[PDB]
Design a protein around this ligand. Structure first.
Ligand code: NA
Lengths: 36, 36
């Protein structure tokens, strides 16, 4: 039972970092859409 | 054990936000593809 709570933590941190990574690429796709 | 649930609720909220943002971007991608 301890482990799941710990996993949820580590997974929380790793989810947060990856969810921050996607946006930077996205904005350029936004700029390309504006250009087109 | 209750904390694990609270952290899991935080997981669900965070993903939710991310789940949205990505859908909002994919819609504009679809619009671009149809236009091209
Ligand atoms: Na794209």
């Amino acid at each position: 039972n301890v482990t799941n709570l710990t996993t949820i933590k580590n997974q929380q941190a790793m989810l947060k970092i990856i969810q921050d990574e996607v946006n930077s690429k996205l904005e350029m796709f936004v700029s390309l859409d504006q250009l087109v």
